[PDB]
Design a protein around this nucleic acid. Structure first.
Ligand SMILES: [Mn+2]
Ligand SMILES: [Mn+2]
Ligand SMILES: [Mn+2]
Ligand SMILES: [Mn+2]
Ligand SMILES: [Mn+2]
Ligand SMILES: [Mn+2]
Ligand SMILES: [Mn+2]
Ligand SMILES: [Mn+2]
Ligand SMILES: [Mn+2]
Ligand SMILES: [Mn+2]
Ligand SMILES: [Mn+2]
Ligand SMILES: [Mn+2]
Ligand SMILES: [Mn+2]
Ligand SMILES: [Mn+2]
Lengths: 105, 82, 94, 99, 97, 106, 99, 86
DNA sequence: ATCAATATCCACCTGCAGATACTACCAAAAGTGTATTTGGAAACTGCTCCATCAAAAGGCATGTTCAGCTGGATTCCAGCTGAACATGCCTTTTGATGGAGCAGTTTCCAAATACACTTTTGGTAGTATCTGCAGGTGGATATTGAT
DNA sequence: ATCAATATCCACCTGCAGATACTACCAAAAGTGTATTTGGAAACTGCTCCATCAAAAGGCATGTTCAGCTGGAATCCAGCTGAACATGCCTTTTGATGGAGCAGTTTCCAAATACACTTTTGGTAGTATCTGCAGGTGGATATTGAT
């Protein structure tokens, strides 16, 4: 017995993704490749965020990723910021940003 | 003291929110204006959250009720389930 | 009692790949869980409409792929499609 | 003479302080009071999970902070540095939250 | 070869029109707008009903899901009147057969 | 003899068709018998509401035939329909006459 | 001696005229050419249903009219009657089109 | 044969066309730089909608962009359009 | 320029909340294998409608001139709003303590799906005849701008 | 105020595109009836976690004073932008024709679902050890604002 995930070279659970597609009422039928493809996409996007978030942690002299780091990573990244433009990260705060005209002298 | 609950949202707290929003100078009329806006936001979200609570025949408003409410209002929130 | 599924152990797995010496708080793990669920729903949702629009009853990897293209910005889409194609190829050859 | 920072100096200090941090800025109990009061008008005798109230304050504070950003841009557009009610109203109108 | 049928709400929209304005007509472009409207609202309500069922681990969409979906979707007075019309239609439907 | 589910429900809108569209739409595993009745009635009601106001706009313009312009006038002049359809574009609907006061001559 | 309306009189006349009507304001053939040019850069050898081009024009004109409304409010907010690029840009920023 | 090369058709969105659109939007006075700004904003809008529409076309393995392709594209971008088969 | 009052940063330290590593238990989930079924690709091709052409013409775009009045700059000062500081009011903390009610389990029946069969109907096609109103005219009323 | 130039109004009209009418036809849709399956309401209960309570403690909201500097008013003027005009291009309109490719029909099998059975795993619950970093320290030095 060998898992579809290991078979597909993935960390994300192919079987669960398939079951979730079936019970989500998205369609009558789900092809075999669909949950594999979707699982891979979700894993990649997860990797991309964790990479940038980890970097944000190091920049702040931390070794543990917290919500703040996820927000810094997402908002400082053009495409991730667009993808998640209508999303709120709890305990994320905002990017340091002061309009130039408000600076003294 | 007998103060309205919306008045419990204080001038210094609103000031702090504005500061995080990058605001340097605030008109005296902003605080009442902000309270009215805040109340409308809460009314809209809580109305939907409670509607989910009622449908589930519950007496307890759960975080998921709120999360679902925020999502359909276009204010998707990460960190509290779903 | 009962059990509550989440993507936590898989997110953690991926974390060690990209950053072996980096941890993640439970709150941050909650945000990652919300993230994975959200994107799942978006992609599955779009793939569902795609099949319906074309009078098909089956969501295939092709619907997932078009959905990915519709939903992700340029470079993210390119790499997601690449990773998705990679995994379907490797799964087929086994 | 005793020491006094110029008007605006401390304001800028505060902006940098709160943009650096993530803690909620409204006091918890008064917010909890407001929430329960509003919910009572929709359905009496409700209870809240603690996380339900927290989700509400996170969403609400994030919304106001974002609104204040747009409001600030509206004030600056009119060549002011002071935000006013008409700045908030303009931002909300263009956002499509009103009028 | 015959061109396959294209369903629409036109004859039903038209019936309702004659009820509210007996001597008023409607252009085909305006009817096109009305058909889009009905399809749109159908999907919005059905979609919300779908989510609602899923949230509560139910496999059935009943009139109760539709009703809650209507309350979530429609503004004040429209929801109130929609709910009463919907409730009336269901009770009348079950009171027969 | 056979009575339609619409007549049984006292409706003009098609209950049978709405039931079929619910089943084909992959909204849920099962659809209760009351669901398409309730839904058809709501859709019919909203249709009635728009047509009432659109016919009035047509009348106000000395017309007997409703065109998209009248649908747009009816929707945008009604606060609740305007909210419901706030993100909707009505083709050939145009906009409400509205000139900002400050732009008028003194 | 030759008659002249004051600056702004005809502009107001034009606002009343076009707010009264529903016809498309961009010429049809030039808009279709723009659609074909843009599409071609995405994918060669595409054909268009005529109604597809019209749906694009209805959507495009509705968008721009709505955008000019917001732009107008931004100009007026700055105590101007003249819309400028910065009015459009502020409107699109608050809309979240370039935020 | 193939048709003439298509280029610079954004200029087909003329100054009077833009003025007309602004009038319908209630605009009384217009800066000289508005016209180029509007063309740029329009191009971005069109590009985005057409990109999604063609994506639907390709998925259906068609070579013809349909009105429904456009309608679906407008919908998912939150510019829902009535009157073309919604 | 100097100089003093604060803010801000860096290095280091330590208590603990929350992360980790452990074993162990188990129902649900995931895989595997067999039998059955069917969605939708492939092939063929009818027939819609898209691209392209021509050819006339007038609606409307372009480019210009002219100056009204707008936007932008400057100056001024009344007063609003920021900074500081003295009170003391109430949020916060936490730790225990009922008990509401979420949530898990079992029962069982109204209402769901599945299926065979019969009736009905809304969509399309084909022609054939009304009809609301767009658009054109002329003439009376209204609006605007000069004086 | 008077009056002239021009837009706006409304009545009247006619051509016709588009709305309406009717008969024919039929595949799909819809309803009726029967048998079979089952989702989830109902009643009961255990245990999570919500509400409340007391109880300090000090953090933080509030009220007051003082004035720095911001908002808004007023004044000026250079030149942008609107209004009007002449010119003639190219969009619009009409109609035709080839044929691309959308879409309808039927055939057929790779891949789907459906069970039954077996194996694995993720969620869990105690239980114990570990550790990243918040928060407090001192002291260096950077920033601010008065001279
Ligand atoms: Mn090109
Ligand atoms: Mn088949
Ligand atoms: Mn020319
Ligand atoms: Mn001059
Ligand atoms: Mn001015
Ligand atoms: Mn109880
Ligand atoms: Mn019939
Ligand atoms: Mn007319
Ligand atoms: Mn059961
Ligand atoms: Mn003074
Ligand atoms: Mn100033
Ligand atoms: Mn061919
Ligand atoms: Mn395991
Ligand atoms: Mn620290």
């Amino acid at each position: 017995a060998k898992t579809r995930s290991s078979r597909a070279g993935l960390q994300f659970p192919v079987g669960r993704v398939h079951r979730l597609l079936r019970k989500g009422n998205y369609s009558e039928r789900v092809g075999a490749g669909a949950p594999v493809y979707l699982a891979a996409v979700l894993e990649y996007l997860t990797a991309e965020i964790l990479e940038l978030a980890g970097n944000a942690a190091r920049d702040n002299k931390k070794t543990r990723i917290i919500p703040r780091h996820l927000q810094l990573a997402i908002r400082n990244d053009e495409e991730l910021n667009k993808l998640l433009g209508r999303v709120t990260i709890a305990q994320g705060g905002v990017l340091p940003n002061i309009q130039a005209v408000l600076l003294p002298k | 003291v007998l103060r309205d609950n919306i008045q419990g949202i204080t001038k210094p707290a609103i000031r702090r929110l504005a500061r995080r929003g990058g605001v340097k100078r605030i008109s005296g009329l902003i605080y009442e204006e902000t309270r009215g806006v805040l109340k409308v936001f809460l009314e809209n979200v809580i109305r939907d959250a409670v509607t989910y609570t009622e449908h589930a025949k519950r007496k307890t408003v759960t975080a998921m009720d709120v999360v679902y409410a925020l999502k359909r209002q276009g204010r998707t929130l990460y960190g509290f389930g779903g | 009692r009962s059990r509550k599924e989440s993507y936590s152990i898989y997110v953690y797995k991926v974390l060690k790949q990209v950053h072996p010496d980096t941890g993640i708080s439970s709150k941050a793990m909650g945000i990652m869980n919300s993230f994975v669920n959200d994107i799942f729903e978006r992609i599955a949702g779009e793939a569902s409409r795609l099949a319906h629009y074309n009078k098909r009853s089956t969501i295939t990897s092709r619907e997932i792929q078009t959905a990915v293209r519709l939903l992700l910005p340029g470079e993210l889409a390119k790499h997601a499609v690449s990773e998705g194609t990679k995994a379907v190829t490797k799964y087929t050859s086994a | 003479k005793p020491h006094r920072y110029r008007p605006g100096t401390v304001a800028l200090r505060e902006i940098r302080r709160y943009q650096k941090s993530t803690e909620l800025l409204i006091r918890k109990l008064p917010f909890q009071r407001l929430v329960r009061e509003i919910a009572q008008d929709f359905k009496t005798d409700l209870r809240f999970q603690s996380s339900a109230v927290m989700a509400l304050q996170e969403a609400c504070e994030a919304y106001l902070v974002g609104l204040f950003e747009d409001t600030n841009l509206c004030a600056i557009h009119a060549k002011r540095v002071t935000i006013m009610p008409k700045d908030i109203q303009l931002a909300r109108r263009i956002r499509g939250e009103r009028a």
